[PDB]
Design an enzyme around this catalytic site. Structure first.
Site, short mmCIF file in Angstrom:
data_model
loop_
_atom_site.label_atom_id
_atom_site.label_comp_id
_atom_site.label_asym_id
_atom_site.label_seq_id
_atom_site.Cartn_x
_atom_site.Cartn_y
_atom_site.Cartn_z
CG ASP D 166 -2.22 0.73 1.16
OD1 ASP D 166 -2.53 1.21 -0.13
OD2 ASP D 166 -2.82 1.26 2.43
CG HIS D 249 -5.51 3.57 -3.65
ND1 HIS D 249 -4.24 3.69 -3.77
CD2 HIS D 249 -5.76 3.01 -2.59
CE1 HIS D 249 -3.70 3.27 -2.45
NE2 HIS D 249 -4.49 2.92 -1.64
CG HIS D 252 -8.16 -1.26 -3.84
ND1 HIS D 252 -9.38 -0.64 -3.38
CD2 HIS D 252 -8.05 -2.17 -2.79
CE1 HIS D 252 -9.59 -1.24 -2.06
NE2 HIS D 252 -8.85 -2.11 -1.95
CG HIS D 267 -6.08 -1.44 0.98
ND1 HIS D 267 -7.03 -1.11 0.10
CD2 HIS D 267 -4.90 -0.62 0.96
CE1 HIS D 267 -6.61 0.22 -0.26
NE2 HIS D 267 -5.38 0.38 0.46
ZN LIG Z 1 -4.35 2.08 0.01
#
Ligand SMILES: [Zn+2]
Ligand SMILES: [Zn+2]
Ligand SMILES: [Zn+2]
Ligand SMILES: [Zn+2]
Ligand SMILES: [Zn+2]
Ligand SMILES: [Zn+2]
Ligand SMILES: [Zn+2]
Ligand SMILES: [Zn+2]
Ligand SMILES: [Zn+2]
Ligand SMILES: [Zn+2]
Lengths: 361, 361, 361, 361, 361
Positions: D166, D249, D252, D267
């Site tokens: 991340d 993101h 994601h 995540h």
């Molecule tokens: Zn993130």
């Protein structure tokens, strides 16, 4: 997004190439129209006609009035019609070359562009423009651009310095369009070809620009002058048209919002200051900005408001320039998100930065 | 000496640009002739015709016989005459595009070139060529080169690797002409514009070539593929035509002196080996040569005589190739002063250098 | 050891942002108290009140007496109590902003800090301070720091130079705390975030500081000024509070041990000299020290004892400064193990080093 | 344009800092509510309550249901109301911390965030989010983020690798927003502070990431682990919130358009692949992309579609992901001008690039 | 703070210098006592006595018991008293040389130190040390250290590798003391002389260490071996004594808290691991740490807990080592602020880092 690259069909540059004009037109036609103003007819116009006659090529001699208006184009196009000429040859400076391009579009004629100074990058382009209103495209880029370095070595040094100024805007402007994802005059995003051309343009000018300026002062042709004439004409031309315009030419256009002695400066002289304004709108260190200021000074180009005949100009006057520069449709929006007020501030900043440099040497 | 730069009038590249064909032809004409072979009519030919119909543009569908002969050109030109089409659209590979250029010259028609693979740098050029005899120029470079990356992403990976091979010869050959003071195909010494274009071509290929090759294997369009398609088409095209040819393409031409399975290889595959031969004729360290060999191998391109179907070839066979490559008028003389025997030796050296590299990994 | 980082909740910087004040306070409250001194009420105070009224936000106008004393805070807090205001807005310089922070702590009110010059890095901090006695923390860092660059472009150039001086101490001091394993004002060792912020602060100032100084002299907002205002406010603020203080601010505090004209200098002007003293206490080459001296001079900042109104000061006077600077609890001990006598010697050394530089140009 | 920077009020990180919780809450209140799920109550929840009791701080023990829904927040907020607690302490992973932030907003309570893994950069942020619909801001960033490295050294290595994934998106995404002139989650353009933080984040991870991963495998706290926990929490948190989000993101979020085993990944694991997709949409050389792939592999993170449980996924399935990723309002538009089809192509390209790398080692 | 540098009076190193012993003692005395254990008397002891006899120098042959105890020193000192010898010559390894130094202090005799291996940097020092309790200084550094490289070329390769290990700790430890402002064994801060010596020590070892190791394996004297013997003896000796000790030797001392096979390793072998622990307590990238691990492995030195005979050691056992290493008065406090628990964690980290490296090659 699509990338687009456009270009004149053929570019020929060399010492005394004006003498082979009949040679390059051989398999094209035997009848032409030659356009030039009074001074240029003496400089190169007669030499061209004489070269065409030797090759049995007819040539209607046209004296350009000096104003690139619809009427003048219509007047010249008629003459060409009657002479039934298939080739238009424009010789001289900006207004003459533009007129010749307009003439060639009316006639769907093959067009030869013969600059007598390397003072702007208008020669190879398919576009043209007292207040600026917009850019307009011709139906094509010129068929043949013929650049004789012996002629340019005899043109005033001020005109070569002006062309270097106009060419020094190329990489600054194109780089800003490439970074912002903006569009070029050609209609799409820039190609890698244009980026390479534009960046090489700046390198060539920093390397040979002063030597080329000294060559012209001595009226001699050298490798340095040959390099800079190509930069000022072919690299700067392709670079700006297919690489992109941004704030520098927008500022040049904004000056038309004003009346005064500033309009006796050349296109290049105005672009030099416009380039400093673009650099003031970007994130550069003092040293990066001074690298350009130093070069402009060594070429006797303008770097302050006083130099461009706007000494002690008022905020209101500068604001008019800024409003015109940020008009809807101007090129500054291809690389920046600024207001007229931001631009007015940048004009005064550039002046202050140049003065600060000067008050150091 | 005069410097000369020539170029197609307009180059447009992007994903699905084939769909805007009617858009780019608007202010040009409403009647065209479309040339493609049987396979290509299915790949893109019908899509183009359908796009032209939507815009009310007539289109005579011509099926290319597959041979670029005078008769085929005469046959196609007649059809265009009768249809009285003013625009020629050639779609497909090399032979089709050349034929279309020849057709457009007969008709003095506007020509659109639509490659379905980025496999050679013939698209943007004004020139063409079982034994090679000479290069011939068309009357002009193409008016519009339209490159659809979605189409190329679906063409065989081998064809992209071939185009990279042909484009990797650009800087090697142009640099040798620039260093020797030789002339380009365009007729004069190289411009700085061509040098910049050619050198950027090599940089782009070393940087993105493998990623572009993987993109095509997965049939997807990426920034890397867009960069390499431009290098393979616009940079390689301008670079070789206006930058100069030397030994690599001379060797490619020399192979026509032989009969055999070698002639099933693509133009690019042959140029890859030709490029190694040029490097063997120059002064490079082992590391500089291996930098190219490494890349060729990662693209599954040929690097040995065995790879080009000439395993255990005899000295006499190689000598025939060398004699043809050094024929009077070949491009090798623009950068080298070598005999056929020197060239034969270099062919075997390149093979030995590649084998030595392979017998190390 | 634990690392600690603290920060104001929100920092907003931009041209004319003062006009969106009602916008940022929307979902917070409809009643405020505005604190400013007589001059500042004219500069920005009325503009703020008028912006709050447009948004139906009440505003008790308070005129700061000019002294940040307990009584003044008590006096202002009462007014806020009665008006029952939930938001405290402090506008102006140091003493006003500190007072406003003290007021907000009494009321447990949301606090907005609006500097009218970028002259110190006090704005974003949770701390405050004729002889210096100690640092005291407020209950929180400010909720909103709103920095309008149009306002700062109109403040005196001397105040921007002062802020650059204060910000130039940030990396020098923080680096010394990081190297020594010392603690920051925030209570623990420095985070990597603070080290990054502090080091970027110095880079930004060497790069844009002079251009920002020229921008203010011409009263214009440029990218260079925007960069330096952020360095002077947000980077310098976080850098010193969460990066650490050392000898430079200890020397600034030590000057309070003296009476005289030195106390008309700004905080920044005193910190500039304090920074040179810290550099004299460290191991740097002559060239590294001169890099700072050169910049201070180009910003018209003080570099000698004479410049700070202590011409021919006596050893005994300097010793008082040194004793105060090395008092128990001062920040110099977070990075150095020096005596008052070592510090007195360093003050005279810095003066001698600056004079030596000056007597070279 | 205005630049905006936001941040939690205080960040404290160190070994065993959980034991000083009563210390940091002293001058704040004596009554709290502690939120954690069943597993976390054993890991750290009871230790915290016991530390609060020693300091005479009441603590209502709340067991989080495991779902961050409005009902759960309402349920927990009621309990806090009744206990009349003024401090909310959330301990654990993502859903728990978000719930705790929502709870604190209802109560206008001081909030303490105590992560038990350094697996995402959600801790310090003021924002939250089966198909993703939008981002929503809380009224404030957390008052206190307390990160105990002894606790994180005992959490699964997979969770540290996820946090590194991340955090590795931070500089990639923020740099693209800075270059495009886009806006951050905080509302304006990025500050220099955020750029410095984001860039330092990437440097810290390439330097210490593997050593920190080995530290966790041996369950020990080292300088390398302390550096990476700060990068994963404070640098990545500020960097993404105040530096900007882009394509990574967005991808994601696009995965939520699919059902399946992919949703058991963390995540961070999904962001790792999303980051490769962003790199495939940018102009990078093969070597630059492989530098990231190499690191992901050394941390056992996913780099192919097969790794993210989408082996042999269909074009139609990937297109759903792409459409969701390019939805109006997604962050990809802050840095790119791409269509869903361009994004689908980039997903397959990233997979192909990773496979090509793997089929090399 | 005062800087202090101490050193033996004279250091002589060269092939076969043992043969000039009578030469160096000429103007000093004619009566000596020679101390060596049984093995060393055969290796060099008799050669020395025979060289002294040739020069009419008496020599009481003493056989060292093998234990450096007060009784053994008292026993040997008596013999010297009776023989009324004014020169003490110690030949051999560590315990013998220390004993000889103790003997010389009792007698106030001129002392000659003759190492038979370059395995530790104890020879030139003025200090000495089953559980370590403290360092004790002799009244002086040795008068003459005579190092015969022919003898060392015949000593076991394992002993040269051990000396390289001990010398590789020099720059690591001294640099940490210099950075922290700590004190050296000599009593003050380090001089620039010691910093130069210590840093050159590391450079010499990375440059010639492996070649010197191969030289010893072939039992030959080369320039590389001469360089490393000086590094292992004179540079490492001065560097550690006058440059400073830190964590590495503290860990070596901490091992005495344990009983077991670990105590059959040499001082150098233990210091190698101790050095990795110090690097794990500092901020280094993975590449910097591996640079040392790689070298240790190429010299067959220990890098894991298993290598130092502590395979699967328990946390409790490692904690004993850590507690001893962090005892009041240990050298680790001269450069670090760590607890026994931090050190225990670093021991396991170093082991994990080495294993990770090994599981890569
Ligand atoms: Zn993130
Ligand atoms: Zn121009
Ligand atoms: Zn006039
Ligand atoms: Zn080719
Ligand atoms: Zn065949
Ligand atoms: Zn300050
Ligand atoms: Zn006064
Ligand atoms: Zn499942
Ligand atoms: Zn030792
Ligand atoms: Zn044993």
């Amino acid at each position: 997004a699509e990338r687009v690259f456009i270009s004149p069909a053929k570019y020929v540059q060399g010492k005394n190439v004006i003498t082979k004009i009949a040679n390059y037109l051989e398999g094209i036609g035997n009848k032409t129209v030659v356009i030039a103003d009074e001074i240029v007819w003496k400089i190169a116009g007669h030499t061209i006609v004489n070269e065409l006659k030797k090759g049995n090529i007819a040539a209607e001699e046209v004296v350009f009035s000096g104003e690139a208006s619809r009427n003048e184009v219509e007047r010249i196009a008629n003459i060409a019609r009657k002479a039934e000429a298939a080739i238009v040859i424009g010789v001289g400076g900006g207004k003459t070359l533009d007129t010749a391009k307009a003439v060639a579009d009316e006639l769907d004629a093959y067009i030869v562009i013969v600059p007598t100074a390397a003072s702007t990058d208008a020669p190879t382009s398919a576009l043209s423009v007292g207040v600026f209103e917009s850019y307009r495209f011709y139906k094509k880029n010129p068929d043949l651009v013929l650049v004789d370095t012996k002629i340019i070595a005899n043109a005033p040094p001020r005109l070569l310095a002006s062309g270097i100024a106009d060419a020094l805007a190329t990489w600054v402007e194109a780089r800003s369009v490439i970074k912002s994802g903006g569009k070029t005059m050609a209609g799409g995003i820039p190609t890698i070809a244009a980026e390479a051309i534009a960046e090489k343009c700046e390198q060539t000018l920093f390397k040979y620009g002063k030597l080329a300026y000294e060559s012209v002062k001595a009226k001699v042709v050298t490798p340095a002058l040959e390099a800079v004439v190509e930069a000022n004409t072919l690299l700067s031309g392709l670079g700006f048209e297919s690489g992109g315009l941004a704030a520098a030419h927008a500022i040049h256009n904004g000056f038309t919002a004003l009346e005064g002695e500033i309009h006796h400066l050349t296109h290049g002289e105005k672009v030099a200051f416009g380039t400093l304004v673009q650099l003031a709108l970007e994130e550069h260190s003092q040293q990066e900005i001074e690298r350009y200021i130093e070069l402009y000074l060594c070429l006797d180009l303008p770097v302050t408001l006083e130099d461009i005949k706007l000494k002690d100009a008022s905020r209101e006057d500068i604001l008019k320039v800024a409003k015109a520069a940020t008009a809807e449709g101007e090129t500054i929006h291809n690389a920046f998100n600024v207001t007229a007020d931001d631009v007015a501030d940048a004009i005064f900043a550039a002046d202050q930065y140049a003065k600060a440099y000067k008050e150091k040497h």
